[PDB]
């Protein structure tokens, strides 16, 4: 296995008002619940159910039950931010978000982009 | 009544007895045939020596009624290929001989005399 529910694991919230955010399991409650926190101010420290999160492969050292400030301090020290973005999974998710917020004019420019990209279709014989 | 495995007791839908099962194929055995067609003529009675070990008429003779079937040699006029499918055997294609005798050409026509003899 590559993913384990353990203290110090970074998780991605999937269901709820915090969908798409990154959190870290500060403490573990039981087989069905977990307590998480995030350095971003918009994400409060809260208890979540395991169905709402997906375990990311990134695990960072974290003492059990650390307060929000020290969690942010450890987060900045170990540079979890942009370490998640280094993964191809994050790039796909961010690209999906950018595609979602595109308007009609941007989509037209995309068509011209890929039409010019398709123009070459040149390969060695 | 009789056995329930033979009902519904109705007329056979064919004058010629159709084979419903052939012996299982074997690659070890070389290529041969399995069935033949003949015409019943009648039977007689014959006297035959009984070489039946353990029987009470061993090394003796008995009288047996035996049916005589005339079997003139059969002419191979074609071949049919069968392909196994998830819905059973299926006739993939049929190849006939170039020249067919009038005996087998008469089969395709109800009135061979009035026909234009256009088969094949």
């Amino acid at each position: 296995f590559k993913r384990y529910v353990e203290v110090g694991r970074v998780v991605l919230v999937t269901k709820g008002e915090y969908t798409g955010k990154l959190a870290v399991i500060v403490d573990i409650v039981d087989h069905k619940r977990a307590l998480i926190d995030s350095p971003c101010s918009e994400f409060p420290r809260q208890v979540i159910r395991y169905g709402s999160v997906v375990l990311t492969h990134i695990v960072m050292k974290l003492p059990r039950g650390a307060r929000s400030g020290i969690v942010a301090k450890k987060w900045k020290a170990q540079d979890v931010c942009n370490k998640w973005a280094s993964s191809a999974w994050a790039k796909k998710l961010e690209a999906k978000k950018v595609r979602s917020q595109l308007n009609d004019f941007d989509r037209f420019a995309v068509m011209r982009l890929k039409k010019q990209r398709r123009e070459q279709v040149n390969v060695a014989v | 009544h009789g056995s329930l495995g033979f009902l519904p007791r109705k007329r056979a839908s064919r004058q010629r007895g159709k084979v419903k099962a052939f012996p299982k194929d074997d690659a070890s055995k070389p290529v041969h045939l399995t069935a033949f067609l003949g015409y019943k003529a009648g039977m007689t009675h014959i006297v035959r020596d009984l070489d039946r070990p353990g029987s009470k008429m061993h090394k003796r003779e008995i009288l047996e009624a035996v049916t005589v079937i005339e079997t003139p040699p059969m002419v191979v006029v074609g071949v049919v290929g069968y392909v196994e499918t998830p819905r059973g055997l299926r006739s993939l294609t049929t190849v006939w001989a170039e020249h067919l005798s009038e005996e087998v050409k008469r089969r395709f026509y109800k009135n061979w005399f009035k026909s234009k003899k256009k088969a094949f």
Binding site: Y4, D27, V29, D30, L35, Q46, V47, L55, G65 | -
Partner: protein, 167 residues
């Protein structure tokens, strides 16, 4: 969702008892009306204090003082069965006394097919030391090296590809 309520009441003052004792209970109910009703039923069944001759002097909702800290609660209960006489003690690990009560009601109704009326809460305490923690699963949750794979991972019908259903 349940809400913890502090309920204080007494009988109506009278020349016999000009200063009746104020009885206070900590009981859980969805709303105030249910909490007062359960209080009066308990007071009648314990101190034989009539609902008619009494009145309610104070009602206050109680919030969890430390709702962000994982805790283990031990709950004493007097469950009613076919014989209508039982008493058990159960331990639940969670972050709110309300949550432990919520878990206990769901558990008892799931196993013994109990109801809110068949259940009466006897005492709720917060067991803080691993020494007093008794249940095996609670102990295996307070182990320092707790880690395990996530179980039960699980419109847009007609998915084109097979699910990963793994990591």
């Amino acid at each position: 969702a349940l809400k913890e309520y502090q309920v204080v009441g007494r009988k109506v003052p009278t020349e016999h008892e000009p200063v009746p004792k104020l009885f206070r209970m900590r009981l859980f109910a969805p709303n105030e009306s249910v909490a007062k009703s359960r209080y009066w039923y308990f007071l009648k069944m314990i101190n034989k204090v009539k609902k008619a001759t009494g009145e309610i002097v104070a009602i206050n909702e109680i919030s969890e003082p430390k709702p962000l800290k994982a805790k283990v609660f031990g709950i004493w209960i007097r469950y009613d069965s076919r014989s209508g006489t039982h008493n058990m003690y159960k331990e639940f690990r969670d972050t709110t006394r309300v949550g432990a009560v919520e878990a206990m009601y769901a558990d008892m109704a799931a196993r013994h097919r109990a109801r809110f009326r068949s259940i009466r809460i006897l005492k709720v305490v917060e067991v803080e030391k691993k020494e007093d923690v008794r249940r095996n699963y609670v102990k295996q949750l307070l182990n320092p090296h707790l880690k395990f794979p996530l179980p039960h991972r699980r419109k847009k019908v007609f998915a084109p590809h097979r699910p990963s259903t793994f990591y």
